[PDB]
Amino acid sequence: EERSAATREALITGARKLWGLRGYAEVGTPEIATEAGVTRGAMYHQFADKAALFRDVVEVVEQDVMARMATLVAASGAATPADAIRAAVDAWLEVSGDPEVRQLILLDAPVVLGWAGFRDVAQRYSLGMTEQLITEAIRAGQLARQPVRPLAQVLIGALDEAAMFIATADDPKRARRETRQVLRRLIDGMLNG
Amino acid sequence: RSAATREALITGARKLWGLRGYAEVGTPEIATEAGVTRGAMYHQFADKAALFRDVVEVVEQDVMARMATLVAASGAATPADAIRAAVDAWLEVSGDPEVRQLILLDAPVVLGWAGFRDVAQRYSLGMTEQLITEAIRAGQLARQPVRPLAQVLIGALDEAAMFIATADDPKRARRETRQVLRRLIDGMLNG
Numbered sequence: 001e002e003r004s005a006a007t008r009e010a011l012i013t014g015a016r017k018l019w020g021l022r023g024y025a026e027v028g029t030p031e032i033a034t035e036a037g038v039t040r041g042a043m044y045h046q047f048a049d050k051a052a053l054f055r056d057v058v059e060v061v062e063q064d065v066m067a068r069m070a071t072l073v074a075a076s077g078a079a080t081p082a083d084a085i086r087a088a089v090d091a092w093l094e095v096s097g098d099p100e101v102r103q104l105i106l107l108d109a110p111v112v113l114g115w116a117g118f119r120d121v122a123q124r125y126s127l128g129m130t131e132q133l134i135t136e137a138i139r140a141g142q143l144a145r146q147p148v149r150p151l152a153q154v155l156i157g158a159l160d161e162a163a164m165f166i167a168t169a170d171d172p173k174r175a176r177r178e179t180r181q182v183l184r185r186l187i188d189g190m191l192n193g
Numbered sequence: 194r195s196a197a198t199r200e201a202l203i204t205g206a207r208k209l210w211g212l213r214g215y216a217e218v219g220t221p222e223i224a225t226e227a228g229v230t231r232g233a234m235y236h237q238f239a240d241k242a243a244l245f246r247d248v249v250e251v252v253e254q255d256v257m258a259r260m261a262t263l264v265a266a267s268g269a270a271t272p273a274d275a276i277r278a279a280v281d282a283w284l285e286v287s288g289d290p291e292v293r294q295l296i297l298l299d300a301p302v303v304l305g306w307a308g309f310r311d312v313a314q315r316y317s318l319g320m321t322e323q324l325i326t327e328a329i330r331a332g333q334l335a336r337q338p339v340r341p342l343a344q345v346l347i348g349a350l351d352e353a354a355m356f357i358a359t360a361d362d363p364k365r366a367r368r369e370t371r372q373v374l375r376r377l378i379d380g381m382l383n384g
C-alpha cells in the first residue's frame with residue numbers, strides 16, 4: 001500500500017533520471033526496475049507498459065519546467081508585464097536548454113506520445129501562463145487589445161520552434177544567442193513598454 | 194514504368210486522403226483509385242506511411258508554387274510588402290481543404306514533429322531566407338541572424354495555420370490569426 005505508493009515515486013524518479021541521460025529508446029523497464037530497487041511485478045502493477053511510465057515522467061518534467069519558468073520570471077525583478085514577457089522568453093530558452101528537458105520533452109515526448117498526445121500535454125502546461133502574461137500586458141496598455149488565444153498560440157509555435165532549433169543545432173551556444181536576439185526583437189516590436 | 198505506377202498511386206492517395214484523411218482510407222482503396230494491383234503498389238511503397246511521405250512532398254511543392262503565384266499577383270512593391278503578401282498567400286492556400294487535411298491535420302500525426310519540421314524547412318526555408326535578406330538589403334528589416342528569424346517565422350506561420358485548421362469557428366480564427374500575424378510582422382519591419 002505505502003510500499004506501492006513509494007514504488008510509483010521511485011519508478012518515476014529512476015525513469016526520469018535514466019531516460020533523461022540516455023533517451024527513452026536506450027533504457028528498458030528492467031533496468032528502471034533495478035534503478036528503483038523494485039521487482040518487475042511491482043513495476044507492472046503501477047505501469048501497464050513503458051509508454052505509461054513515460055507519460056507520468058513527462059507530467060513531473062512539465063510541472064518542473066513551468067515551476068522553473070515562474071521562478072525565473074519572479075527572480076528577474078520584472079516590474080511591468082512587458083518586462084515579465086521579456087524575462088519569460090529568456091526563461092524558456094534557459095529551461096528548454098536543460099539537457100534532461102531537451103531529451104525528454106523536445107526529442108522523446110513528441111515520438112512516444114505522438115503528435116496529438118504531445119500537443120495536448122504542451123498546451124495544458126504552457127497556454128495558461130502565456131495567456132496570463134498577454135492579458136496582463138494588454139490590461140497595462142503595453143500590448144494592443146487583440147484576441148488573446150490566437151496571439152498565445154502563434155507565440156507558442158514560435159517559442160516551440162526556437163527550442164527545437166537550438167536543441168538540434170550544430171552550435172547550440174550560437175543558436176541560443178542568435179535565437180534569443182531574434183525573439184527579443186520580435187517581442188520589442190509588439191510591446192508598448 | 195515504375196514511375197507511372199508511383200505517379201498514379203501518389204495522385205490517388207493525395208485525392209482520397211485529401212478528401213477523407215489518412216486514417217480513413219487504406220492502401221487497397223488507393224490501389225483501386227490508381228487502377229493498379231496491391232502487388233504493384235507494395236513493390237513501390239513498403240507501407241501506408243511511405244506513400245504518405247511522397248504525397249506530402251508533392252503537396253508541399255505545389256503549396257510553395259501556389260504561394261509564389263499569389264505573391265506575384267499581389268502587386269507587392271517592396272520586400273516588406275512581399276513578406277506581408279507571402280503571409281496572406283499561406284493563409285489563403287492553407288484554407289484549401291486538401292492542404293488542411295494532408296499538411297495541417299495528417300502530416301504532423303504521420304510524420305511527427307521532427308519529420309513535419311524537416312519537410313516544412315526543406316520546402317520553405319530558402320524562400321523565407323530570401324524574403325528576409327531582401328527586406329534587410331532594402332533597409333525595411335534590422336540586420337539580424339537570417340536563419341534563426343526564418344525558422345521562428347516558419348514555426349509561427351505553421352502553428353497559425355494549424356490553429357485555424359482545428360478551430361471551433363475557423364472563419365473567426367482565420368480573421369483573428371491574420372490580425373495577430375499582421376501586428377507581429379508590422380512590429381518586425383521598419384518605417
Ligand SMILES: O=C1C[C@H]2CC[C@@H](C1)N2CCc1ccc(C(F)(F)F)cc1
Pocket residue numbers: 252253254256257276279280283296312313314316317320321324346347350351
Ligand atoms: O508547404 C509548406 C507550407 C507550410 C507547411 C509546411 C511549410 C512548407 N510551411 C511554410 C509556411 C510559411 C509560409 C510563409 C512564409 C513566408 F514566406 F511568408 F515567410 C514562410 C513559411
